Amino acid sequence: TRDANGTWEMESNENFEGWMKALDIDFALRKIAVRLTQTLVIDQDGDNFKVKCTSTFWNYDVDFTVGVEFDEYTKSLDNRHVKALVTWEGDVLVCVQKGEKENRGWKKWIEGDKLYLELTCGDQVCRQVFKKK
Ligand SMILES: *C/C=C(C)/C=C/C=C(C)/C=C/C1=C(C)CCCC1(C)C
């Protein structure tokens, strides 16, 4: 479907550490991030999204409009400037983040009550699955 609204609880996360290493997140921090439970809340109104991924001390938020490139500064992650763009490819929500890292971005597949999220950087893919609470 295209309706990603909801509160999404993590069911699985594969290759998180490889993806974080490809972004250059500090090794010591990685070993903390791997322990943290993540909650993903998405508010979607037309083209307008507000995405909030939260854990006890570490969050990632992004707000965007589909089809509108935006300057993103990943201040809580690797602290880089990218030019980000989120588009629909059929029912897949696709983000490409142009900048230093190649093949950087993410894709969301919504399948009923499930959300599949693939985060890419370089040659690494992290595959996550969430279920709608
Ligand atoms: C559509 C959903 C998206 C783009 C979710 C993105 C979430 C992240 C990039 C979360 C990253 C985090 C870490 C790399 C370390 C631990 C803290 C998190 C979960 C906020």
Topology, element by element:
Elements: E1 6-14, H1 16-23, H2 27-33, E2 39-45, E3 48-54, E4 60-65, E5 70-73, E6 81-89, E7 92-98, E8 105-111, E9 114-121, E10 124-132
Antiparallel strand pairs: 1-2, 1-10, 2-3, 3-4, 5-6, 6-7, 7-8, 8-9, 9-10
Function: Intracellular transport of retinol.
Subcellular location: Cytoplasm
Family: Belongs to the calycin superfamily. Fatty-acid binding protein (FABP) family.
Task: Please explain how this structure is put together.
With 133 residues, the chain is mostly beta strands. The longest helix has 8 residues. Strands 4-3-2-1-10-9-8-7-6-5 form a ten-stranded antiparallel sheet. It has two helices and ten strands. It has one domain: Calycin beta-barrel core domain (Lipocalin, Beta Barrel). A hairpin with a 2-residue loop joins strand 9 and strand 10. Helix content is 11%, strand content 55%. Bound molecules: retinal (RET). The site of retinal has 14 residues, from strand 3 and strand 8. It is found in: Cytoplasm. It comes from Homo sapiens (Human). Intracellular transport of retinol. This is Retinol-binding protein 2. InterPro entries: Calycin, Fatty_acid-bd, ILBP, Lipocln_cytosolic_FA-bd_dom.
* Count of alpha/pi helices: 2
Q: What ligand species are in this complex?
A: retinal
Terminal residue distance:
17 Å
CATH class: Mainly Beta
Give the CATH topology: Lipocalin
Strand content: over 45%
**Number of β-strand runs:** 10
The SS-based structural class is mainly beta
Strand order of the largest sheet: 4-3-2-1-10-9-8-7-6-5
Q: What would CATH call the homologous superfamily?
A: Calycin beta-barrel core domain
Shape: globular
Q: Tell me what the CATH architecture is.
A: Beta Barrel
Structural Rg: 14 Å
Order of helices and strands: EHHEEEEEEEEE
**What level of helicity do the residues show?**
10-25%
* Main sheet specs: 10 strands, antiparallel
- How many separate domains make up the residues? 1
PDB class: transport protein
Keywords: Retinal complex+ beta barrel, transport protein
Assembly: monomeric
Entry title: Crystal structure of Q108K:K40L:T51V:T53C:R58W:T29L:Y19W:Q4A mutant of cellular retinol binding protein II complex with all-trans-retinal at 1.33
